[PDB]
Amino acid sequence: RQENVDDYYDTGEELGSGQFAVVKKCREKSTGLQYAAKFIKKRRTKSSRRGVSREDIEREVSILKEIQHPNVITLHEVYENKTDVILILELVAGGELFDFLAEKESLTEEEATEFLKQILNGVYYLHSLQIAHFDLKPENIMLLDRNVPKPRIKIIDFGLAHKIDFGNEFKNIFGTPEFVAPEIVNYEPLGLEADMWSIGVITYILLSGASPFLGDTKQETLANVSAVNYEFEDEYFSNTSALAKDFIRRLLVKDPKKRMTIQDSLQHPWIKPKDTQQALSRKASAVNMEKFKKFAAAK
Structure with a gap:
């Protein structure tokens, strides 16, 4: 899995914010195309009550990788670092x-x-x-x-x-x-x-x-x-x-x-x-x- 999303994307304004996730508009540097980046905080330790488990993040990713249909959001790229998994998703504007x-x-x-x-x-x-x-x-x-x-x-x-x-x-x-x-x-x-x-x-x-x-x-x-x-x-x-x-x-x-x-x-x-x-x-x-x-x- 890819690592440094800042090297590949310019990140812009917040689109929304949920439980342990924030979504911001972004622009891919190589294509100049617009996407939505969904930053999901990983649970740091088993006992922590902030963040999403590995299993739950990987389930969402696995399902998104599968989906290709005009009436469902599509996954563009996935990044992961120490603190977050970052889903680069189709921009729904x-x-x-x-x-x-x-x-x-x-x-x-x-x-x-x-x-x-x-x-x-x-x-x-x-x-x-x-x-x-x-x-x-x-x-x-x-x-x-x-x-x-x-x-x-x-x-x-x-x-x-x-x-x-x-x-x-x-x-x-x-x-x-x-x-x-x-x-x-x-x-x-x-x-x-x-x-x-x-x-x-x-x-x-x-x-x-x-x-x-x-x-x-x-x-x-x-x-x-x-x-x-x-x-x-x-x-x-x-x-x-x-x-x-x-x-x-x-x-x-x-x-x-x-x-x-x-x-x-x-x-x-x-x-x-x-x-x-x-x-x-x-x-x-x-x-x-x-x-x-x-x-x-x-x-």
Whole structure:
């Protein structure tokens, strides 16, 4: 693994900052092309509670090395020194999808599905390689460039992603309560299905500007998710099509085995209309933009 990133890159402004990671814009000296450098602090000793373990960093790297698809972030280079592992990643310059959408006058369901379909294709690619993302939520759905007529979705942040191992169950507490599936809430075996639930949550918010399971407390949220306690309130879904509600309903399903898969989501008639009447229902229907704007501004 390569060593001195400063000899190869000019590093610029901070793009964001998480748990034990900071992301800065950078420019490769040899090509003059722009990237995002994700600096991940290594755990210095077994007993330390700052930094990420070797195993967790190498898992993220291994998965990123695999991925090549236009709707998923790509890895350019990896550097490591004594203190950090540095991932040189594709620059995703266009911000979060929801911030972009909240600047529009309106969003028809037809327009909404043009973005949602790109998310579905990115997840389709991942699931086809047996990779679960495990952290799908609005802030991980970004745009490459906000200044083009048809902006391109990029799924980011593979810090929680796992290659499904057929021979061993995977269980773990991770993610944000309002966006995670009942099996995560209940510490049951996890697989590709959890991503499908999160897509359902993302879709519900896209259309209404309301979080389906969010309670006043963490405990209330966990309980709402486990019970699959949600509804389509008239106040929020007054211009929402029956196809759209059916798409969300098929994803927000307690038993992972009964939940819609990624392949079936792409064939659902809200995404791929079978006749002109269905298509016209999607074109005429629209998001609750006044409430959507409020959701985006609040967070």
